[PDB]
């Protein structure tokens, strides 16, 4: 009726409310693990960076981007899409590796050719060395990453616990390592092919960290979003409730009119 269709739509909103409620809480649980990983990783990353800073390492081009397979992590996908696109105006001829289905789709719309490598299975778990290692190994072989004296990777840095700013860093090539000024103040040896190993090693070490930052933002965004959803659903609940109440009253009135009509005739 009016009454039942109102009621059913209100129930739909209710179920949506329940789901968004469930999701935001579960997301928070998952988020705790996400942040923990990112901490330990960032400490590790810092030890590597300690060398590169002091080294003054100094940077076609590669573009790597990071999102999960999974969506429902707000505007992670599209803030990232915009910042990729910005550096795809810096060089549209850049070979794009899209690590994540969601960024793949949006980015595919802006340019589809530029997509060269892509990865499926990301969203299923928090970033791990095993994943990073395999992607890196494949990244080197297929995309010949070392040739490009510019690699830049994009991910979402979770700036504050309610925000995310898509962020980038440049992956230091063997070329960068060569021309870093301090590298002799560290005693390099001719008894090792440190560029050919170190490039690979920081390809992954940087990648894993970038992923961890991105992942943390992903689960964080899901919580934030699912919370905002619940509020909006509450408001629609209120709007349909007033309509429901009104429809009850009107039905009562029409029934009474019927009774009166019957007596009157």
């Amino acid at each position: 009726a009016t009454l039942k269709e109102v009621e059913m739509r209100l129930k739909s909103i209710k179920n949506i409310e329940k789901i968004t409620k469930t999701m935001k809480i579960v997301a928070s649980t998952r988020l705790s693990k996400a942040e923990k990983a990112k901490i330990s990783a960032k400490k590790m990353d810092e030890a590597e960076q300690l060398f590169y800073k002091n080294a003054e390492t100094k940077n076609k081009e590669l573009i790597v981007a990071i999102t999960s397979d999974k969506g429902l992590c707000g505007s992670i996908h599209s803030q990232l899409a915009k910042a990729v696109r910005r550096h795809l105006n810096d060089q549209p001829n850049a070979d794009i590796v899209t690590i994540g289905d969601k960024i793949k789709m949006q980015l595919l719309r802006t340019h589809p050719n530029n997509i060269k490598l892509s990865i499926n299975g990301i969203g299923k778990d928090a970033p791990t060395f095993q994943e990073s290692a395999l992607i890196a190994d494949k990244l080197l072989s297929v995309m010949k990453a070392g040739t490009y004296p510019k690699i830049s990777i994009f991910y979402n840095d979770p700036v504050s616990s309610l925000s995310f700013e898509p962020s980038e860093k440049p992956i230091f090539n063997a070329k960068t390592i060569e021309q870093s000024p301090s590298f002799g103040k560290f005693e390099i040896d001719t008894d090792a092919n440190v560029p050919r190993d170190l490039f690979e090693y920081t390809l992954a070490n940087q990648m894993l960290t970038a992923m961890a930052q991105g992942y943390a933002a992903e689960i964080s965004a899901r919580r934030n979003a699912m919370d905002n959803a619940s509020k909006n659903a509450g408001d629609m609940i209120n709007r349909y409730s007033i309509l429901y109440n009104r429809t009850r009253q009107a039905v009562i009135t029409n029934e009474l009119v019927d009774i009166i009509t019957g007596a009157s005739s």
Partner: protein, 120 residues
């Protein structure tokens, strides 16, 4: 100073004597050791902070005494004891496995790791 860390840990991220197995054989670092860059091989490592000594089996990584005298050790996964008997049985099988099966090189690394384990 000295850092030793994993993306999952922060082992020693100070430490007084460090014994490391590196591209250049084995290297030991004690107090002021001139700043280095050595790629760490998968390793049996001894770390001593004071006379207290902790023993690590390490996946390989990178070693860098900084000009900050901070020996940044970066590795993926280590303690020594966790890596260690079922592994001996498994590794014995893995040695066999190289016979059957990039895969040849991989299986060789499994054997290499078995040598590293054997060294303990």
């Amino acid at each position: 100073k000295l850092q030793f860390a994993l993306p999952h840990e922060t082992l020693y991220s100070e430490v007084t004597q460090v014994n490391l197995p590196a591209k250049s054989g084995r290297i030991g670092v004690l107090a002021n050791h001139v700043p280095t860059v050595e790629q760490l091989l998968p390793g049996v490592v001894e770390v001593m902070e004071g006379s207290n000594s902790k023993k690590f089996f390490i996946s390989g990584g990178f070693a860098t005494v900084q000009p900050d005298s901070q020996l940044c050790v970066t590795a993926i996964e280590a303690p020594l004891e966790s890596f260690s008997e079922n592994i001996k049985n498994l590794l014995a099988e893995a040695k066999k496995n190289v016979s059957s099966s990039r895969e040849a090189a991989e299986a060789a690394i499994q054997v290499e790791v078995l040598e590293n384990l054997q060294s303990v």
